[PDB]
Amino acid sequence: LVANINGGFESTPAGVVTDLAEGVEGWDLNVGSSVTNPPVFEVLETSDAPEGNKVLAVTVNGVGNNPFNIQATALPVNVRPGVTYTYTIRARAEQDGAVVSFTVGNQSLDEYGRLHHQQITTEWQPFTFEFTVSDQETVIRAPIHFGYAANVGNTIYIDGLAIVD
Ligand SMILES: O[C@@H]1[C@@H](O)[C@H](O[C@@H]2CO[C@@H](O[C@@H]3CO[C@@H](O[C@@H]4CO[C@@H](O)[C@H](O)[C@H]4O)[C@H](O)[C@H]3O)[C@H](O)[C@H]2O)OC[C@H]1O
Ligand SMILES: [Ca+2]
Ligand SMILES: [Ca+2]
């Protein structure tokens, strides 16, 4: 049981994602206009996948002004007021030196919590944290920020987002 939808990209056909807002069920991908060299978002079928058969790959070619100018946001995330949740996701990168922040917030852009400038390695690792829905929201969001300068020239892979009571 999880709060989010399509946490492992298994719903989505393999291929480059061109419809960023609606091409991946359960997710909203977004690239801001300050990112002059846009990234490539791809759902990959690979036996490397920690969950199922598929992962999301984000190839970063350039950045903008804020880390969220390249982001993948899980939406909707169905929760209950006052409840504490565990967030877990798996991530790795093509090259050394990647940086990602894993966040959760409300539709008002208020963050309930995050894992900040996580050090992503060339091997799959789990990244986990707890957060509490400290207000009266029931439908929240989980933005992952990839727009760090250190990621230029890298591909970041994510899989198996699970937000659990
Ligand atoms: O989808 C996008 C949303 O993600 C975005 O939300 C804003 C994201 O930035 C937020 O502010 C961040 C909060 O984290 C600060 O870093 C802290 C440093 O200390 C660490 O201990 C702690 O874990 C970190 O949280 C960072 O300085 C600051 O910039 C902001 O509050 C959110 O509103 O909004 C735009 C959406 O498109
Ligand atoms: Ca998967
Ligand atoms: Ca969407």
PDB file of C-alpha atoms and ligand atoms in Angstrom:
ATOM      1  CA  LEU A   1       0.000   0.000   0.000  1.00  0.00           C
ATOM      2  CA  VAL A   2       1.408   3.392  -1.045  1.00  0.00           C
ATOM      3  CA  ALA A   3       0.153   6.962  -1.213  1.00  0.00           C
ATOM      4  CA  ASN A   4       1.564   7.652  -4.652  1.00  0.00           C
ATOM      5  CA  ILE A   5       0.772   6.217  -8.084  1.00  0.00           C
ATOM      6  CA  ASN A   6       3.053   4.488 -10.569  1.00  0.00           C
ATOM      7  CA  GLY A   7       5.980   4.857  -8.177  1.00  0.00           C
ATOM      8  CA  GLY A   8       8.115   2.516 -10.253  1.00  0.00           C
ATOM      9  CA  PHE A   9       7.141   3.721 -13.754  1.00  0.00           C
ATOM     10  CA  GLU A  10       5.712   0.323 -14.599  1.00  0.00           C
ATOM     11  CA  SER A  11       2.546   1.906 -16.089  1.00  0.00           C
ATOM     12  CA  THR A  12       4.454   3.917 -18.628  1.00  0.00           C
ATOM     13  CA  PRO A  13       5.601   2.796 -22.053  1.00  0.00           C
ATOM     14  CA  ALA A  14       9.338   2.774 -22.555  1.00  0.00           C
ATOM     15  CA  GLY A  15      10.699   5.746 -24.455  1.00  0.00           C
ATOM     16  CA  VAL A  16      11.552   9.426 -24.180  1.00  0.00           C
ATOM     17  CA  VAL A  17       8.926  11.427 -22.405  1.00  0.00           C
ATOM     18  CA  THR A  18       7.820  14.343 -24.491  1.00  0.00           C
ATOM     19  CA  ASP A  19       4.524  15.078 -22.693  1.00  0.00           C
ATOM     20  CA  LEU A  20       6.114  16.145 -19.442  1.00  0.00           C
ATOM     21  CA  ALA A  21       2.988  17.140 -17.498  1.00  0.00           C
ATOM     22  CA  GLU A  22       0.835  14.162 -18.427  1.00  0.00           C
ATOM     23  CA  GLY A  23       3.008  11.550 -20.184  1.00  0.00           C
ATOM     24  CA  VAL A  24       3.844   9.637 -17.002  1.00  0.00           C
ATOM     25  CA  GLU A  25       0.881   8.500 -14.922  1.00  0.00           C
ATOM     26  CA  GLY A  26       1.230   9.622 -11.315  1.00  0.00           C
ATOM     27  CA  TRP A  27       3.959  12.172 -12.105  1.00  0.00           C
ATOM     28  CA  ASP A  28       4.372  15.716 -13.320  1.00  0.00           C
ATOM     29  CA  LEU A  29       7.739  16.408 -14.946  1.00  0.00           C
ATOM     30  CA  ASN A  30       8.762  20.014 -15.455  1.00  0.00           C
ATOM     31  CA  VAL A  31      11.617  21.932 -17.030  1.00  0.00           C
ATOM     32  CA  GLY A  32      11.744  25.655 -16.471  1.00  0.00           C
ATOM     33  CA  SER A  33      12.588  28.115 -19.199  1.00  0.00           C
ATOM     34  CA  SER A  34      15.884  29.052 -17.521  1.00  0.00           C
ATOM     35  CA  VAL A  35      17.251  25.674 -18.486  1.00  0.00           C
ATOM     36  CA  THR A  36      18.734  26.582 -21.860  1.00  0.00           C
ATOM     37  CA  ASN A  37      19.877  23.014 -22.718  1.00  0.00           C
ATOM     38  CA  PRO A  38      16.888  20.848 -21.752  1.00  0.00           C
ATOM     39  CA  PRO A  39      17.240  17.465 -20.110  1.00  0.00           C
ATOM     40  CA  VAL A  40      16.009  14.185 -21.537  1.00  0.00           C
ATOM     41  CA  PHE A  41      13.459  12.251 -19.480  1.00  0.00           C
ATOM     42  CA  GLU A  42      13.245   8.587 -20.526  1.00  0.00           C
ATOM     43  CA  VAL A  43      11.416   5.543 -19.174  1.00  0.00           C
ATOM     44  CA  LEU A  44      13.851   2.682 -19.741  1.00  0.00           C
ATOM     45  CA  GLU A  45      13.142  -1.003 -19.745  1.00  0.00           C
ATOM     46  CA  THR A  46      16.173  -2.584 -18.188  1.00  0.00           C
ATOM     47  CA  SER A  47      17.119  -5.623 -16.204  1.00  0.00           C
ATOM     48  CA  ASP A  48      18.926  -3.148 -13.901  1.00  0.00           C
ATOM     49  CA  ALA A  49      15.561  -2.012 -12.539  1.00  0.00           C
ATOM     50  CA  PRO A  50      15.321  -2.364  -8.792  1.00  0.00           C
ATOM     51  CA  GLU A  51      11.531  -2.613  -9.100  1.00  0.00           C
ATOM     52  CA  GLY A  52       9.667  -4.209 -11.976  1.00  0.00           C
ATOM     53  CA  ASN A  53      11.162  -3.817 -15.402  1.00  0.00           C
ATOM     54  CA  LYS A  54      11.398  -0.026 -15.756  1.00  0.00           C
ATOM     55  CA  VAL A  55      13.166   3.040 -14.387  1.00  0.00           C
ATOM     56  CA  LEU A  56      13.078   6.793 -15.051  1.00  0.00           C
ATOM     57  CA  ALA A  57      16.286   8.259 -16.444  1.00  0.00           C
ATOM     58  CA  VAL A  58      16.953  12.010 -16.333  1.00  0.00           C
ATOM     59  CA  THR A  59      19.844  13.145 -18.532  1.00  0.00           C
ATOM     60  CA  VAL A  60      20.987  16.603 -17.486  1.00  0.00           C
ATOM     61  CA  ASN A  61      22.555  18.784 -20.163  1.00  0.00           C
ATOM     62  CA  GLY A  62      22.387  22.136 -18.417  1.00  0.00           C
ATOM     63  CA  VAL A  63      20.707  23.819 -15.482  1.00  0.00           C
ATOM     64  CA  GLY A  64      18.671  26.886 -14.677  1.00  0.00           C
ATOM     65  CA  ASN A  65      18.600  29.201 -11.639  1.00  0.00           C
ATOM     66  CA  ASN A  66      17.058  26.921  -8.978  1.00  0.00           C
ATOM     67  CA  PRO A  67      17.345  23.170  -8.453  1.00  0.00           C
ATOM     68  CA  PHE A  68      13.630  22.608  -9.073  1.00  0.00           C
ATOM     69  CA  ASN A  69      13.934  23.986 -12.594  1.00  0.00           C
ATOM     70  CA  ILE A  70      14.451  20.320 -13.505  1.00  0.00           C
ATOM     71  CA  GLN A  71      12.034  18.206 -11.489  1.00  0.00           C
ATOM     72  CA  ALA A  72       9.943  15.069 -11.384  1.00  0.00           C
ATOM     73  CA  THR A  73       6.987  15.402  -9.004  1.00  0.00           C
ATOM     74  CA  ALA A  74       4.828  12.504  -7.833  1.00  0.00           C
ATOM     75  CA  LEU A  75       1.209  13.729  -7.990  1.00  0.00           C
ATOM     76  CA  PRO A  76      -1.335  12.992  -6.590  1.00  0.00           C
ATOM     77  CA  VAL A  77      -0.025  11.657  -3.281  1.00  0.00           C
ATOM     78  CA  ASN A  78      -3.046  10.655  -1.194  1.00  0.00           C
ATOM     79  CA  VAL A  79      -2.568  11.224   2.529  1.00  0.00           C
ATOM     80  CA  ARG A  80      -4.389  11.972   5.763  1.00  0.00           C
ATOM     81  CA  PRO A  81      -3.950  14.974   8.089  1.00  0.00           C
ATOM     82  CA  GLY A  82      -1.570  14.389  10.979  1.00  0.00           C
ATOM     83  CA  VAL A  83      -0.235  11.078   9.762  1.00  0.00           C
ATOM     84  CA  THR A  84       3.470  10.296   9.558  1.00  0.00           C
ATOM     85  CA  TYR A  85       4.758   8.646   6.376  1.00  0.00           C
ATOM     86  CA  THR A  86       7.958   6.953   5.316  1.00  0.00           C
ATOM     87  CA  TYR A  87       9.368   7.968   1.960  1.00  0.00           C
ATOM     88  CA  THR A  88      11.673   5.579   0.180  1.00  0.00           C
ATOM     89  CA  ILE A  89      13.126   5.729  -3.346  1.00  0.00           C
ATOM     90  CA  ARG A  90      16.055   4.136  -5.146  1.00  0.00           C
ATOM     91  CA  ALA A  91      18.551   6.167  -7.152  1.00  0.00           C
ATOM     92  CA  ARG A  92      21.871   5.865  -8.978  1.00  0.00           C
ATOM     93  CA  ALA A  93      23.764   7.786 -11.673  1.00  0.00           C
ATOM     94  CA  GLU A  94      25.758   7.114 -14.832  1.00  0.00           C
ATOM     95  CA  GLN A  95      28.782   9.022 -13.544  1.00  0.00           C
ATOM     96  CA  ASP A  96      30.206   9.979 -10.186  1.00  0.00           C
ATOM     97  CA  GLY A  97      29.096  13.170  -8.522  1.00  0.00           C
ATOM     98  CA  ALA A  98      25.376  13.529  -8.847  1.00  0.00           C
ATOM     99  CA  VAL A  99      23.279  15.513  -6.393  1.00  0.00           C
ATOM    100  CA  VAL A 100      19.502  15.187  -5.921  1.00  0.00           C
ATOM    101  CA  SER A 101      17.027  16.502  -3.398  1.00  0.00           C
ATOM    102  CA  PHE A 102      13.997  14.367  -2.593  1.00  0.00           C
ATOM    103  CA  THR A 103      11.127  16.447  -1.232  1.00  0.00           C
ATOM    104  CA  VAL A 104       7.461  16.309  -0.282  1.00  0.00           C
ATOM    105  CA  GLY A 105       5.112  19.263   0.043  1.00  0.00           C
ATOM    106  CA  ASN A 106       1.560  20.501  -0.388  1.00  0.00           C
ATOM    107  CA  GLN A 107      -0.221  22.137  -3.321  1.00  0.00           C
ATOM    108  CA  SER A 108       0.606  25.437  -1.627  1.00  0.00           C
ATOM    109  CA  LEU A 109       4.322  24.577  -2.128  1.00  0.00           C
ATOM    110  CA  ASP A 110       4.919  24.255   1.589  1.00  0.00           C
ATOM    111  CA  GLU A 111       7.482  21.458   2.203  1.00  0.00           C
ATOM    112  CA  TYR A 112       6.836  18.930   4.902  1.00  0.00           C
ATOM    113  CA  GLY A 113      10.344  17.509   4.608  1.00  0.00           C
ATOM    114  CA  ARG A 114      13.202  16.527   2.370  1.00  0.00           C
ATOM    115  CA  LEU A 115      16.448  14.708   1.861  1.00  0.00           C
ATOM    116  CA  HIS A 116      18.792  17.552   0.938  1.00  0.00           C
ATOM    117  CA  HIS A 117      21.716  17.376  -1.582  1.00  0.00           C
ATOM    118  CA  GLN A 118      21.838  13.606  -1.487  1.00  0.00           C
ATOM    119  CA  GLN A 119      25.005  12.146  -2.905  1.00  0.00           C
ATOM    120  CA  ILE A 120      23.993   9.828  -5.686  1.00  0.00           C
ATOM    121  CA  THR A 121      26.528   7.153  -6.643  1.00  0.00           C
ATOM    122  CA  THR A 122      26.952   4.838  -9.601  1.00  0.00           C
ATOM    123  CA  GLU A 123      25.276   2.010  -7.612  1.00  0.00           C
ATOM    124  CA  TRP A 124      21.628   1.762  -6.654  1.00  0.00           C
ATOM    125  CA  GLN A 125      20.973   2.952  -3.136  1.00  0.00           C
ATOM    126  CA  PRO A 126      17.801   3.532  -1.146  1.00  0.00           C
ATOM    127  CA  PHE A 127      17.101   7.067   0.101  1.00  0.00           C
ATOM    128  CA  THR A 128      14.535   7.279   2.904  1.00  0.00           C
ATOM    129  CA  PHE A 129      13.090   9.811   5.312  1.00  0.00           C
ATOM    130  CA  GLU A 130       9.944  10.386   7.401  1.00  0.00           C
ATOM    131  CA  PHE A 131       7.591  13.289   7.192  1.00  0.00           C
ATOM    132  CA  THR A 132       4.327  14.310   8.874  1.00  0.00           C
ATOM    133  CA  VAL A 133       1.322  15.910   7.205  1.00  0.00           C
ATOM    134  CA  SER A 134       1.246  18.791   9.691  1.00  0.00           C
ATOM    135  CA  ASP A 135      -1.761  20.587   8.156  1.00  0.00           C
ATOM    136  CA  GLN A 136      -5.232  19.484   6.843  1.00  0.00           C
ATOM    137  CA  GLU A 137      -4.230  18.422   3.326  1.00  0.00           C
ATOM    138  CA  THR A 138      -5.249  15.129   1.773  1.00  0.00           C
ATOM    139  CA  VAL A 139      -3.670  15.416  -1.699  1.00  0.00           C
ATOM    140  CA  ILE A 140       0.007  16.378  -1.703  1.00  0.00           C
ATOM    141  CA  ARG A 141       2.984  16.149  -4.037  1.00  0.00           C
ATOM    142  CA  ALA A 142       6.539  14.821  -4.009  1.00  0.00           C
ATOM    143  CA  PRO A 143       8.984  16.974  -6.044  1.00  0.00           C
ATOM    144  CA  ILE A 144      12.400  15.494  -6.857  1.00  0.00           C
ATOM    145  CA  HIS A 145      14.898  18.208  -7.829  1.00  0.00           C
ATOM    146  CA  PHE A 146      17.585  17.418 -10.408  1.00  0.00           C
ATOM    147  CA  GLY A 147      18.699  20.889 -11.495  1.00  0.00           C
ATOM    148  CA  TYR A 148      22.068  20.918  -9.714  1.00  0.00           C
ATOM    149  CA  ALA A 149      25.100  22.114 -11.676  1.00  0.00           C
ATOM    150  CA  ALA A 150      27.048  19.081 -10.569  1.00  0.00           C
ATOM    151  CA  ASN A 151      24.696  16.902 -12.623  1.00  0.00           C
ATOM    152  CA  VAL A 152      25.578  18.413 -16.038  1.00  0.00           C
ATOM    153  CA  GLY A 153      26.793  15.594 -18.174  1.00  0.00           C
ATOM    154  CA  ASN A 154      25.194  12.897 -16.035  1.00  0.00           C
ATOM    155  CA  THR A 155      22.122  10.728 -16.149  1.00  0.00           C
ATOM    156  CA  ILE A 156      20.236  10.098 -12.904  1.00  0.00           C
ATOM    157  CA  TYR A 157      18.071   7.017 -12.588  1.00  0.00           C
ATOM    158  CA  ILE A 158      15.219   6.678 -10.115  1.00  0.00           C
ATOM    159  CA  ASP A 159      12.859   3.875  -9.274  1.00  0.00           C
ATOM    160  CA  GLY A 160      10.509   2.501  -6.658  1.00  0.00           C
ATOM    161  CA  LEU A 161       9.113   5.579  -4.986  1.00  0.00           C
ATOM    162  CA  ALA A 162       7.012   4.315  -2.058  1.00  0.00           C
ATOM    163  CA  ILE A 163       5.286   6.648   0.384  1.00  0.00           C
ATOM    164  CA  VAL A 164       3.920   4.490   3.182  1.00  0.00           C
ATOM    165  CA  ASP A 165       2.022   5.140   6.450  1.00  0.00           C
TER     166      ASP A 165
HETATM  167  O1  LIG B   1       7.725  21.641  -7.245  1.00  0.00           O
HETATM  168  C1  LIG B   1       8.374  22.798  -6.840  1.00  0.00           C
HETATM  169  C2  LIG B   1       8.522  22.828  -5.356  1.00  0.00           C
HETATM  170  O2  LIG B   1       9.482  21.877  -5.004  1.00  0.00           O
HETATM  171  C3  LIG B   1       9.002  24.214  -4.948  1.00  0.00           C
HETATM  172  O3  LIG B   1       9.105  24.193  -3.594  1.00  0.00           O
HETATM  173  C4  LIG B   1      10.049  25.069  -3.015  1.00  0.00           C
HETATM  174  C5  LIG B   1      11.346  24.269  -2.947  1.00  0.00           C
HETATM  175  O4  LIG B   1      12.329  25.016  -2.229  1.00  0.00           O
HETATM  176  C6  LIG B   1      12.010  25.227  -0.964  1.00  0.00           C
HETATM  177  O5  LIG B   1      12.962  25.860  -0.134  1.00  0.00           O
HETATM  178  C7  LIG B   1      14.139  25.159   0.145  1.00  0.00           C
HETATM  179  C8  LIG B   1      13.913  24.367   1.433  1.00  0.00           C
HETATM  180  O6  LIG B   1      15.114  23.643   1.726  1.00  0.00           O
HETATM  181  C9  LIG B   1      16.098  24.508   2.007  1.00  0.00           C
HETATM  182  O7  LIG B   1      17.192  23.705   2.470  1.00  0.00           O
HETATM  183  C10 LIG B   1      17.160  23.232   3.787  1.00  0.00           C
HETATM  184  C11 LIG B   1      18.618  23.235   4.255  1.00  0.00           C
HETATM  185  O8  LIG B   1      18.759  22.552   5.484  1.00  0.00           O
HETATM  186  C12 LIG B   1      18.491  21.254   5.395  1.00  0.00           C
HETATM  187  O9  LIG B   1      18.660  20.913   6.752  1.00  0.00           O
HETATM  188  C13 LIG B   1      16.988  21.128   5.144  1.00  0.00           C
HETATM  189  O10 LIG B   1      16.709  19.752   4.981  1.00  0.00           O
HETATM  190  C14 LIG B   1      16.670  21.801   3.858  1.00  0.00           C
HETATM  191  O11 LIG B   1      15.303  21.804   3.762  1.00  0.00           O
HETATM  192  C15 LIG B   1      16.508  25.354   0.805  1.00  0.00           C
HETATM  193  O12 LIG B   1      17.418  26.324   1.231  1.00  0.00           O
HETATM  194  C16 LIG B   1      15.305  26.132   0.349  1.00  0.00           C
HETATM  195  O13 LIG B   1      15.627  26.711  -0.859  1.00  0.00           O
HETATM  196  C17 LIG B   1      10.708  25.984  -0.837  1.00  0.00           C
HETATM  197  O14 LIG B   1      10.319  26.147   0.479  1.00  0.00           O
HETATM  198  C18 LIG B   1       9.595  25.316  -1.581  1.00  0.00           C
HETATM  199  O15 LIG B   1       8.542  26.228  -1.690  1.00  0.00           O
HETATM  200  O16 LIG B   1       8.227  25.218  -5.412  1.00  0.00           O
HETATM  201  C19 LIG B   1       8.248  25.286  -6.835  1.00  0.00           C
HETATM  202  C20 LIG B   1       7.593  24.011  -7.346  1.00  0.00           C
HETATM  203  O17 LIG B   1       7.584  24.023  -8.754  1.00  0.00           O
HETATM  204 CA    CA B   2      10.365   0.170 -11.788  1.00  0.00          CA
HETATM  205 CA    CA B   3       0.787  14.371 -14.390  1.00  0.00          CA
END
